[PDB]
């Protein structure tokens, strides 16, 4: 899997939440919806790589948001990859979604599929516009809002790792869940609640897990997702969207290869994928 270009578009509005899993994260406001961020992110990645939308062979999306996806804020399915195909003009592309998967696992799966099918230009997009989800007030956990677009060229050579979190190996980490809202009265009410029990040692466990997984590829520099504000400057974090600045930094330093590590809050594991980089 080769990363041709990276696009990212985040809301300027940051919201701080207190708690062991809290932090200052970007948050969509009012009736803003994901496509407002996703399309420009995709378009800047396409322009960087000099790839036209009709050249896109595959679009794979990742978005938990149950609403605020497109112009009709009430639609939840089919998932955003399809309306992206329409407004983008990728008339030759195949579209599907990998739901609650991490980015690292998705890139691994897509590199396997796309190389097998002979695709040359693949688009993996990650985005959130989470007005429809109530944050976890007790722990402070919330999803960062924004859009990330990775324009990729498959090679079939990406390696993959699914590793455990660090810290106490005997400790059972309580996973993230998004239960359905059982008392929806207005169409604009939240559709689900973020539920991630307060676990003070979790942010360090994820980072320790990152370092352990990176030990399987000691020859590679690596990038990571930061889902929590604990220990971060200003308590600010962008979740999976942190990858944009790190990947751009890797391009600036002329790195050929790279390891990208994600955090899966549903499985309470870390997942890494090896990638190739283009110059920039």
């Amino acid at each position: 899997m080769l990363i041709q270009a990276v696009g990212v578009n985040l809301p300027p509005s940051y919201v701080c939440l207190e708690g062991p899993l809290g932090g200052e994260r970007p948050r969509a406001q009012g009736d803003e919806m994901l496509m407002q961020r996703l399309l420009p992110a995709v378009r800047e990645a396409l322009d960087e790589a000099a790839v036209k939308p009709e050249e896109i062979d595959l679009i794979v999306g990742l978005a938990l948001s149950p609403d605020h996806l497109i112009e009709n804020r009430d639609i939840m399915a089919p998932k955003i990859g399809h309306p992206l195909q329409k407004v983008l003009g990728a008339n030759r592309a195949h579209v599907f979604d990998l739901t609650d998967s991490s980015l690292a696992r998705a890139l691994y799966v897509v590199d396997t599929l796309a190389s097998d099918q002979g695709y040359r230009n693949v688009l993996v997009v990650r985005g959130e516009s989470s007005q429809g989800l109530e944050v976890d007030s007790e722990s402070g956990f919330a999803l960062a809002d924004g859009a990330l677009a990775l324009l990729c060229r498959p090679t079939g050579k990406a390696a993959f790792r699914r590793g455990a979190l660090g810290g106490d190996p005997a400790q059972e980490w309580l996973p993230l869940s998004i239960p359905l809202n059982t008392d929806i009265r207005q169409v604009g009410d939240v559709k689900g609640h973020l539920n991630l029990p307060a676990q003070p040692g979790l942010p360090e466990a994820v980072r320790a897990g990152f370092t352990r997984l990176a030990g399987d590829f000691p020859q590679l520099n690596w990038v990571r997702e930061e889902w929590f504000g604990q220990g971060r400057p200003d308590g600010r974090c962008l979740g999976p969207f942190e990858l944009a600045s790190q990947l751009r930094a890797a391009q600036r330093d002329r790195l050929d290869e790279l390891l990208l590590i994600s955090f899966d809050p549903f499985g309470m594991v870390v997942e890494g994928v090896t990638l190739e980089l283009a110059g920039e």
């Binding site: 399915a77 979604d97 609650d100 396997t112 599929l113 097998d116 359905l180 169409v187 549903f266």
Partner: protein
């Protein structure tokens, strides 16, 4: 001269389905609030009865998959720890049960099924994955599984499709009359000979008519009292009429592409397995590729339109009834909202039906 690389063969080893216990006739009181019902409407779509999961009796998207998966693993003598990957699909964003893994979790949007199911079944080495292509999800999961097996990244892949679509149906609308619930489980492995392989596949999408068939948070179409909003399957009457010729032709396009990649023609195919949206659609697809009525089955009569489970159920039906035999070369194809289209050309060996 050097030697050419060779991808591993993909064996479709086992398949099973698990349908709801209860059936509902077209005159069942569940449709009492449905307007514009006529005897011609029922005859056109070819659905006589369908099944809905009854959560009170313990039936849900998860419980019936555990039964179907445990039965297939037991009948095929597959050790849980030998499964390298688990790929699940569920078209309804609303899930309801997580077994013993998350006993206190009720209606939910996330997590999906793969990770929880792998723990329920003891798939201790399985990479869990949850994919979404609506009615084409079973073909998508076979494509993903096949590519992993072909490139040596997995030797056993368990594929799951569980459709609890009834929890999205608005029974004050005709939209609730066709769809139905059901589950399917399949096992794909690295073939040890040439008897079974996925010869080629073709997938493509077109979002022109995306807004026609959606899942939208809204009130019932004809509510009564202080009705609450829910996630409902929603149909755009005025847009659906425009796409007249668009689904009938695009499945053949996918079938033609896949046969072209496989180096075969329609004459080289023994049987066909189509998605089951409507009798007129299946016949249009079959006629668009040159398939004769004796080369495929219509199965929506007693099950309804089970989204992604219709294809695997029809495949299982053809196998169980002897219409699909070992050594046969078949084509599987269907359409899905989005919209998406997928076709696969299979060389089949012996497939365990359980």
């Amino acid at each position: 001269l050097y030697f050419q690389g060779h991808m591993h063969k993909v064996k479709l080893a086992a398949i099973t389905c698990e349908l709801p216990a209860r059936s509902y006739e077209n005159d069942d009181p569940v449709f009492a609030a449905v307007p514009d019902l006529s005897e011609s409407w029922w005859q056109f779509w070819g659905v006589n009865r369908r099944g809905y999961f009854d959560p009170r009796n313990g039936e849900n998207e998860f419980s019936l998959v555990v039964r179907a998966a445990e039965r297939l693993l037991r009948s095929s003598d597959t050790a849980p720890d030998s499964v390298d990957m688990l790929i699940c699909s569920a078209s309804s964003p609303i899930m309801t049960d997580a077994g013993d893994v998350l006993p206190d979790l009720r209606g939910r949007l996330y997590p999906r099924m793969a990770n929880v199911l792998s723990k329920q079944l003891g798939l201790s080495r399985a990479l869990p994955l949850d994919s979404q292509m609506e009615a084409a999800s079973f073909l998508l999961n076979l494509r993903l599984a096949a590519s992993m097996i072909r490139q040596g990244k997995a030797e056993k892949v368990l594929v799951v499709c569980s459709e609890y679509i009834s929890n999205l149906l608005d029974f004050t609308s005709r939209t609730s009359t066709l769809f139905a619930d059901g589950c399917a489980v399949a096992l794909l492995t690295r073939g040890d000979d040439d008897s079974c392989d996925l010869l080629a596949s073709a997938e493509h999408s077109d979002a022109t008519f995306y807004e026609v068939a959606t899942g939208r948070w809204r009130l019932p179409e004809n509510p009564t009292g202080e009705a609450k909003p829910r996630l409902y399957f929603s149909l755009f009457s005025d847009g659906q009429n425009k796409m007249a010729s668009f689904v009938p032709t695009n499945v053949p396009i996918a079938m033609r592409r896949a046969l072209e990649k496989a180096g075969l023609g329609s004459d080289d195919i023994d049987y066909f397995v189509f998605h089951q949206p409507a009798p007129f659609l299946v016949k249009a697809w079959a006629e668009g590729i040159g398939a004769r009525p004796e080369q495929y089955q219509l199965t929506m009569g007693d099950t309804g339109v089970m989204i992604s489970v219709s294809i695997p159920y029809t495949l299982m039906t053809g196998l169980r009834e002897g219409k699909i035999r070992p050594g046969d070369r078949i084509v599987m194809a269907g359409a899905a909202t989005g919209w998406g289209f997928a076709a696969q050309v299979w060389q089949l060996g012996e497939v365990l039906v359980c």
